[PDB]
Amino acid sequence: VLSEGEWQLVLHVWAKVEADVAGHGQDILIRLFKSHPETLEKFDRFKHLKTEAEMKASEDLKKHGVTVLTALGAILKKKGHHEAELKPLAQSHATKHKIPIKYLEFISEAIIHVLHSRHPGDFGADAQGAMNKALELFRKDIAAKYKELGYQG
Template sequence: MGYKKDSTDEGGTNQAENILGQPRRILFQALQIMADYDMILKHWGPVEADYSTYGNLVLTRLFTEHPETQKLFPKFVSIPHGDLAGNAAVSAHGATVLKKLGELLKAKGNHAAILKPLSNSHATKHKIPINNFRLISEVIVKVMAEKAGLDGAGQQALRSVMAVVIADMDANYKELGYAG
């Protein structure tokens, strides 16, 4: 069935606009997410220059604001909250987390090859529930706002990007049969 230039559906909407609207919307969303990556990466330099310090800030805050998350890290379980900030192992693991996030950000959405093994290890070996990625994402947003100058628009961009990453991780979790 062909569409006439002036044909409309029952609601009076031009059918050609309906057909073209979806690709335009997808294109707009793709352009927006690319702009989000660029905005975040503009503020990533200080983090990249000192992964250990930022990593410690992120994990210390995560464990302080969400104490239940500390139990998911066997090597950190016995560290009192007051000792987290000065702990080298916390800094090292935080640095690892942020380096991986940096890789994901620089991939600008083309992250399947990075995310698949990460999802696999966190689902099958570490058994990390997907909600914990939402928690740490929000902590990263706060730390970047306070320490790396990420403004309100940048914070929203980071939340949007992390929502995509977490949704992709969740899809990987489901493929693996992990309900986390």
């Protein structure tokens, strides 16, 4: 569980992410795709993209970035009480998209990398630690739903 002071560090940087949801969303997905090419293969709608320049140019990819970050933001603002928000997400990612838990660890790394690039002053070590904990909490709860359904993995 995160303390109230750790949640404050998380939401303070998130308010910054919200000033440019689309730019952040795009940097995160591109970092994920370049760092872990096997993840791009799960998206039939983005599979045709080969270069970083093509990725940057895709308006649809940018629109999906907003989708992801808006859902994540709704979760973070619940400060751990995210049952109603996390459940639909785990069911679709487990049974429809077939996303292994390890891929959620990859996107978490991408999120941390991008927040660091874009917000050094509001993203020092302490904030980085709180963010990691929040993303771990997210993964832990998702993993529990996956197991129940028979997808732990």
